[PDB]
């Protein structure tokens, strides 16, 4: 069976567009944003997310990962795509050759 041509329309690599479209009718476009900022401020205000060393090691690893993606991402993307295209073309030039074989026989 074939495979769909795309994934799931995620935003900021963390949130799928389904959530934005799901909150838009009853909060508008800034609704998800205001909900997120309010939840953030309540989380780090009532000390349910303790700011500690882990906060800064997390900021480090997240900066590293976002830069790693935004730099070496398209390269890996088109590399996987080229792997696929090479395999496909090799198989097709492997079909043609056997057709030619049988016709020559």
């Amino acid at each position: 069976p074939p495979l769909p041509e795309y994934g799931g329309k995620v935003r900021y690599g963390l949130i799928p567009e389904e959530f934005f479209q799901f909150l838009y009718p009853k909060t508008g476009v800034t609704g998800p944003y205001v909900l997120g900022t309010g939840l953030i401020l309540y989380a780090l205000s009532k000390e349910i997310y303790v700011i500690s060393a882990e906060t800064f090691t997390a900021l480090s690893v997240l900066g590293v990962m976002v830069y790693g993606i935004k730099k070496y991402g398209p390269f890996v993307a088109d590399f996987a795509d080229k792997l696929n295209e090479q395999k496909l073309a090799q198989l097709e030039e492997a079909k043609q050759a056997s057709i030619q074989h049988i016709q020559n026989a």
Binding site: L23, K26, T27, G28, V29, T30, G31, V34, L35, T37, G38, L39, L41, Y42, L44, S45, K46, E47, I51
Partner: protein, 77 residues
């Protein structure tokens, strides 16, 4: 960048004096819905969505008290 303030000034304003009549009338509406028992006739979707908007405005209360204390994490004292 600039559409941030566009959205702020276009949706999230304090109610204009001409609106809190509409606000009081719609609060009359919803607590009338409470007095009748119409809330029980509400299904999953807008129930959880009203819960979400309540969470949002409660976050707004917490933001209000943090701007009260002029500090964010706990009390500066």
């Amino acid at each position: 960048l600039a559409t941030f303030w566009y959205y702020a000034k276009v949706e999230l304003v304090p109610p204009t004096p001409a609106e809190i009549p509409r606000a009081i009338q719609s609060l009359k509406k919803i607590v009338n819905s409470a007095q009748t028992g119409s809330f029980k006739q509400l299904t999953v979707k807008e129930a959880v969505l009203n819960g979400l908007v309540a969470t949002e405005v409660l976050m707004w209360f917490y933001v209000g008290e943090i701007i009260g204390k002029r500090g964010i994490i706990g009390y500066d004292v």
